Design a protein around this ligand. Structure first.
Ligand code: HEM
Ligand SMILES: C=C(C)[C@H]1CC=C(C)CC1
Length: 137
């Protein structure tokens, strides 16, 4: 289920984080705007941009903590505020997070693994809702 999935992802987090974030940027190429340095780069190229591996892993480190502290795929309001109140998310809307979670769920669906993809989809919905409530537009 969801908790085991957090363990699975954490066991190879660098690899999952890159592959899911790349799935996100390739499904929604306009989202590369948020990361100028990423434009005109193949996946392999991105995977050798220091900022890429480090921002991606830090995104997934914190996403797995927020997932771990959730009850029934509902994140802590305190975690939602943090994501809203981060200066680097100033430009962001819940739409940015929507699309990340659509790509993550689709990645899990297409994987050969028994990810609880329905739980991740509810998690993404609930986090978007929490982000709105915490003041993201
Ligand atoms: C659960 C979802 C997310 C988490 C946990 C998260 C977490 C983080 C963290 C921890 C940082 C700081 C990393 C660092 O610079 O050292 C960061 C930076 C940033 N995040 Fe997010 N993030 C999430 C979703 C998003 C989404 C959906 C976007 C855009 C569509 C985004 C855009 C950015 C940008 C642009 C930066 C700074 C730019 C850079 O990488 O140099 N984040 N995020
Ligand atoms: C495109 C990727 C991997 C970005 C994810 C999050 C941050 C903060 C920058 C790298």
């Amino acid at each position: 289920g969801f908790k085991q999935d957090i363990a699975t992802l954490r066991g190879d987090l660098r690899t999952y984080a890159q592959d899911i974030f790349l799935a996100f940027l390739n499904k929604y190429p306009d989202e590369k705007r948020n990361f100028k340095n990423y434009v005109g780069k193949s996946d392999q190229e991105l995977k050798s941009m220091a900022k890429f591996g480090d921002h991606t892993e830090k995104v997934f480190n914190l996403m797995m903590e927020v997932a771990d502290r959730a009850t029934d795929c509902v994140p802590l309001a305190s975690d939602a505020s943090t994501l809203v109140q981060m200066k680097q998310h100033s430009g962001l809307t819940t739409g940015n997070f929507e699309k990340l979670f659509v790509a993550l769920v689709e990645y899990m669906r297409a994987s050969g693994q028994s990810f609880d993809s329905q739980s991740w989809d509810r998690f993404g919905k609930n986090l978007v809702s929490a982000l709105s409530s915490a003041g993201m537009k």
